[PDB]
Amino acid sequence: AVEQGFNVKPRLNYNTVSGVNGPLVILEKVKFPRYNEIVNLTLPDGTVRQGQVLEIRGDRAIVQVFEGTSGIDVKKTTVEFTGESLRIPVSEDMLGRIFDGSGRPIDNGPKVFAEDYLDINGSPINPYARIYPEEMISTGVSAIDTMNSIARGQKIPIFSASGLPHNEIAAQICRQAGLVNFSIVFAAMGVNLETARFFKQDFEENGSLERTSLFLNLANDPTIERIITPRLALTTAEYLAYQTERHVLTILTDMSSYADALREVSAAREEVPGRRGYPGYMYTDLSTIYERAGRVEGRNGSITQIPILTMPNDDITHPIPDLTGYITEGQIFVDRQLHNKGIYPPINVLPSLSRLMKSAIGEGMTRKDHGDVSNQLYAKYAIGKDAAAMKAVVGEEALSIEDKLSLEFLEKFEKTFITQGAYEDRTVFESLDQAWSLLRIYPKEMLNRISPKILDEFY
């Protein structure tokens, strides 16, 4: 029997505000302040803004206001301490709902009829209670389904840059991310109305609104709610996937914008900064967000995060992409050079990686040649890039027969294999057959990475 308790706890209305530095509101005479506690700042105008406590002294309680500090005074601002951390009202009815960055619905609908209140921060999932994700998601993208495979329970971001079709690639995966249906929890952190409308239209056309939940924190929305949005989306995803046994496909976008929100909060707190001013605990925060995805023992559900990370200057050495690639289980790399060449999806397969490909692309799950073909394609594409550099620097006639064959392989790999176009829906087996057609350019002697048995069977 489910045990839920009726209880009324009065809340103290602290009129004492002693600092509104930046996005942080500092109280003065709080009685027993509670760390990570939701407070309501009743503005003199009348509107209330949620807040979270980030640090407590003996009597002070620094509060970060999610909706911004614009309009906050000291004389007539009263802070009401709710006494508990943020608990989003979760329910199975959230599917089909569009929420704001703070969890308040914006779909012209009623407040969600709560089935339970779950802590936003969650808890670390027991490593002994986890299951290694082995079921391979057969995304329609050939550059992903082959050479960087996605499993149910993986956290595989999309490393992109400004102007690249990361939104289009993620929407394509969402449209066609079946096994070899997926509920979607889409979190928007500071993306523009163009991207939000594209995703909403993308879901409506494909019929995903029957089973999707959106947390749209647009660029017009306050920047501090970009901190709260991914936690809300991921606790909703955790609720669905585990307590409801659904297969959630969490799609975070602008994790770089989330990290910028952290930097804005960290800079206001005057904490000791890391690289590029980012908080020294940004690794821990990003890990807390990312590691909420995976399969769990006993439960028949899973979470498959695809956080759309846009590298600021297309540099993977930036702290945000570096820590994201160190935490997550791979990355999908979108190349500005390939986009300039006109290749869609412009997935640069070399920097891209899928750590679960080794277990998800074996025999039985897919064809017996998946790993060998992927390794051979990787080796020949690297040789092609080296041969292109050699042709650019040294004369073309100096290139060997192998170099010319590898240049041809690069041309047909980028212009026929990677180039897919939207709505194409290449099955894993069809993509493997096309990859073999690519590899049939070389004589069987040159194919070193292919094992002899597979080479005899499939060549």
Partner: protein
């Protein structure tokens, strides 16, 4: 009334101000300097004054107005120049009789003596009016006629009395609205906080192109009416000239030209030249100045006022958008707005983040660029407007890796990159066709198929020709051009022709000051047909050197097609172009 406690640069920590709100407008000093509160540390309240701080003594009174920095929307804005905090520079000059701007001038943001012809709208006594609804219109000037008077947003109720048709000043009552038993009196103007975007019913996906008038911008990297645009580039690249040409020759109904950190001489040039120019819109020749207002906050003006200038300009653009007009804001330097933000942040003591620009710079830029977009106005009658923000970023050191440039590229949809190599050698517009991109080419397919169906195909062909020629030039510059194929030579020659004649546009020459969309499409057709004819003739067997020797006349005719003045009209210019292709086809068949 508080007191001044500390004055360090453009920030004034004023004590004895318990009760001051955040971003609440104050009056620091005996001269009533305009300032906004940033931090409130107890009774202290740090203020960014929007004027010159020299002469502020410890103990000067600081008044608390009670309202945020509020622009004064209404009739009379259209043909004026403002000081960033919406102070009419003409009124300041007339009142002061000095070429300087005195500290603390409190001239009204809108002329109050001018009487405006008022025509009441469809609303009458008893009709329930909502926020943003049009209850009348005023004749502002010949070009912007019927400057529709909007009920202020968040103001609602039943109309108790409406002013009849006649002549009214701004201070005169125009409407009385009863809400919950409390009457509210409404004038021709109304104030609005610049920080908060003006509400709209529902934004729409922009689909109509913003005809810049420049060939490369209008063809290769188009911009729609209602989309953010970025123009990075070092000094001398052409950002200001591109912005001024867009304001002069755009299809937008109104212009909000915002100069933050720009020279005063650019403002003087605009004020001197815009009345001279005329537009063919509204069925008559009216000066450009009649539909463009200027928010002038030059580089030597107070640092803190650049943000106020940006916000005032974008709010004026939002007002004329809510009027249902197609407006295009032109921020002259978002980089200079960001440098003002960096100066304020450094004087305050916040963490430098990247390069010293404050950590909230990205969020502020994102919000400002999100203010723009095509939208349906808030209230009935239904009308649709748009704000196109085309802001020129100014990277430090001429490198597109600056934090301001990176944030602007992340948030905007159109990126018109400028290369200083082409900025020199007089190759304006110095657009870098390799790094520049426009994400509205997909949505603009509807307009292109409706009006010029071959425009996207021709643009794609020209883009791929330019890319092939870039690769060919890269390989040739290190390995010479003694091994190129005939097709490669054709590509190189045609792309050099495109760069020399089509892509480059002399905006200060009569023939190339404004190349309209039809002329640009016809010239793209001419150049692409020239390239195709050369390729076909050479593939037939003709040597490229002999073909060029025989068709130098056709090449000169194609390259001189820019000199066709668009003032002759679409019919005359297109008639000459049709003969140009026919002659070129004949001169490629006779030669072959």
């Amino acid at each position: 009334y508080g007191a001044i406690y500390s004055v360090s640069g453009p920030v004034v920590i004023a004590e004895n101000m318990i009760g001051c709100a955040m971003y609440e407008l104050v009056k620091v000093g005996h001269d009533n300097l305009v300032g906004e509160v940033i931090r409130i540390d107890g009774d202290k309240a740090t203020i960014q004054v929007y004027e010159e701080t020299a002469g502020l003594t410890v103990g000067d009174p600081v008044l608390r107005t009670g309202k945020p920095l509020s622009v004064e929307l209404g009739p009379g804005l259209m043909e004026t120049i403002y000081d960033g905090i919406q102070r009419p520079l003409k009124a300041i000059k007339e009142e002061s009789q000095s070429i300087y701007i005195p500290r603390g001038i409190d001239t009204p943001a809108l002329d109050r003596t001018i009487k405006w012809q008022f025509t009441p709208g469809k609303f009458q006594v008893g009709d329930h009016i909502s926020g943003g609804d049009i209850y009348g219109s005023v004749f502002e000037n010949s070009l912007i006629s019927s400057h529709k008077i909007l009920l202020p947003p968040r103001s609602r109720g039943t109309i108790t009395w409406i002013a009849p048709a006649g002549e009214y000043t701004l201070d005169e009552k125009i409407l009385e609205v009863e809400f919950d038993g409390k009457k509210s009196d409404f004038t021709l103007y109304h104030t609005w906080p610049v920080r908060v975007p003006r509400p709209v019913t529902e934004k729409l996906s922009a689909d109509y192109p913003l005809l810049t008038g420049q060939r490369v911008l209008d063809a290769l990297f188009p911009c729609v009416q209602g989309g953010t645009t970025c123009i990075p580039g070092a000094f001398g690249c052409g950002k200001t000239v591109i912005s001024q040409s867009l304001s002069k020759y755009s299809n937008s109904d109104a212009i909000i030209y915002v100069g933050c950190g720009e020279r005063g001489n650019e403002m003087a040039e605009v004020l001197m030249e815009f009345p001279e120019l005329y537009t063919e819109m509204s069925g008559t020749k009216e000066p450009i100045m009649k539909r463009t207002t200027l928010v002038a906050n030059t580089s030597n003006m107070p640092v803190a006022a650049r943000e106020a200038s940006i916000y005032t300009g974008i709010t004026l653009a939002e007002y004329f958008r809510d009027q249902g007009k197609n407006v295009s804001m032109i921020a002259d330097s978002s980089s200079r707005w960001a440098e003002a933000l960096r100066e304020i942040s450094g004087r305050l003591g916040e963490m430098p983040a990247d390069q010293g620009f404050p950590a909230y710079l990205g969020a502020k830029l994102a919000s400002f660029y999100e203010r723009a977009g095509k939208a349906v106005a808030l209230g009935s009658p239904d009308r649709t407007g748009s704000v196109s923000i085309v802001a020129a970023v100014s990277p430090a050191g001429g490198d597109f890796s600056d934090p301001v440039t990176t944030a602007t590229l992340g948030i905007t949809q159109v990126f018109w990159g400028l290369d200083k190599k082409l900025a020199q050698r007089k190759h304006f517009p110095s657009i870098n066709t390799s790094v520049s991109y426009s994400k509205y080419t997909n949505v603009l397919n509807k307009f292109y198929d409706s009006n010029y169906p071959e425009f996207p195909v021709l643009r794609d062909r020209m883009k791929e020709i330019l890319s092939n020629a870039e690769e060919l030039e890269q390989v040739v510059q290190l390995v010479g051009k003694s091994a190129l194929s005939d097709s490669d030579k054709i590509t190189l020659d045609v792309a050099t022709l495109i760069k020399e004649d089509f892509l480059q546009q002399n905006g200060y020459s009569t023939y190339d000051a404004f190349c309209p969309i039809w002329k640009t499409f016809d010239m793209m057709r001419a150049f692409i047909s020239y390239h195709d004819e050369a390729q076909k003739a050479v593939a037939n067997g003709a040597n490229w050197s002999k073909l060029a020797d025989s068709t130098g006349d056709v090449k000169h005719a194609v390259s001189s097609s820019k000199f066709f003045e668009p003032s002759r009209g679409e019919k005359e210019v297109h008639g000459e172009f049709e003969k140009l292709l026919s002659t070129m086809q004949e001169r490629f068949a006779e030669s072959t």
